[PDB]
């Protein structure tokens, strides 16, 4: 069995966000999930992933051939869920028009090194595309063309075996 530890699934489009700290993102209703890092993973790098869908064609009335640059990230509290400082994690960028075919879904795949205890994770889109700004007046904290279908880990360090 190739085990998968699911952390969360999201149906809503992820919001554009710069690294403005935990309080700012929560104020703007950026959904999150918490990960409780156990003592045996205290300060130990592990793999965190997301199934990511980019879909731009006609979204908010955007042109079907408009090129949209994307770069999803996790923003994760360095301290616990009550602290503000966030660390940025990215792994890929993509560009051009996006149809959002499930067989084209991308994978954010990062190495995360965290202290023991709870950390809050914000799945976000970090790239605000200028064509989007001009065509459909997208700005920071608007819903982007990026959706975190599922956040997960297939790292044996995190999964329940079976
Ligand atoms: Ca296995
Ligand atoms: Ca563009």
Secondary structure of the chain as H, E, C letters: CCCCEEEEECCCCCEECCCCCHHHHHHCCCCCEEEEECHHHCCCCEEEEEEEEEECCCHHHCCCCCCCCECEEEEEECCCCCCCCEEEECCCCECCCCECCHHHCEEEEEEECCCCEEEEEEEEECCCCHHHHHHHCCCCCCECCEEEEEEEECCCCCCCCC
- Contact between 14 and 124 under an 8 Å Cβ cutoff? The reply is yes
Q: From the CA of 156, how far away is ligand 2's center (Å)?
A: 38
Residues 33, 157, 53, 100, Cα dihedral to 10°: -150
Closest ligand to the CA of 138: 2
- CA-to-CA separations, 73 to 50, 51, 89, in angstroms, rounded: 9, 12, 5
Q: From the CA of 100, how far away is ligand 2's center (Å)?
A: 16
- Contact between 46 and 111 under an 8 Å Cβ cutoff? The reply is yes
Q: From the CA of 154, how far away is ligand 2's center (Å)?
A: 33
CA distance 47 to 27: 28
Closest ligand to the CA of 2: 1
Q: From the CA of 125, how far away is ligand 1's center (Å)?
A: 31
Q: From the CA of 161, how far away is ligand 1's center (Å)?
A: 6
Q: How many angstroms is the resolution?
A: 2.3
Strand order in the sheet with 86-89: 33-37, 117-125, 72-77, 86-89
Q: From the CA of 67, how far away is ligand 2's center (Å)?
A: 4
Residue 75: how many other CB atoms lie within 10 Å? 24
Closest ligand to the CA of 160: 1
- Contact between 17 and 122 under an 8 Å Cβ cutoff? The reply is yes
Residue spans per domain, the chain: 1-162
Residue located via tokens 């929560």: 26
Rg (CA), the chain: 16
CATH placement of domain 1-162 = 2.60.120.720
Q: From the CA of 1, how far away is ligand 1's center (Å)?
A: 5
CA distance 89 to 111: 8
Residues 6+ apart with CB under 8 A from 115: 37, 42, 43, 78, 79
Burial of 18 (0-12, 13-18, 19+ CB in 10 A): middle
| Dihedral pair phi/psi, residue 139, rounded to 5° | -145, 175
CA distance 98 to 95: 8
């Amino acid at each position: 069995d190739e085990e998968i530890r699911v952390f969360k699934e999201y149906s809503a489009r992820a919001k554009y966000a710069q690294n403005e700290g935990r309080t700012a993102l929560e104020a703007n209703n950026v959904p999150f999930f918490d990960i409780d890092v156990p003592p045996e993973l205290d300060g130990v790098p592990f793999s965190l992933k997301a199934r990511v869908r980019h879909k731009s064609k006609g979204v908010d009335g955007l042109g079907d051939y408009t090129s949209i640059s994307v770069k999803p990230a996790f923003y994760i509290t360095e301290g616990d869920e009550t602290t503000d400082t966030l660390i940025k994690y990215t792994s890929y960028g993509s560009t051009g028009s996006h149809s959002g075919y499930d067989f084209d879904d991308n994978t954010l795949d990062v190495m995360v090194t965290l202290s023991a205890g709870v950390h809050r994770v914000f799945p976000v889109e970090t790239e605000l595309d200028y064509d989007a700004v001009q065509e459909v007046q997208h700005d920071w904290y608007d819903e982007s063309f990026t959706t975190f279908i599922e956040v997960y880990s297939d790292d044996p360090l995190l999964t329940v075996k079976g």
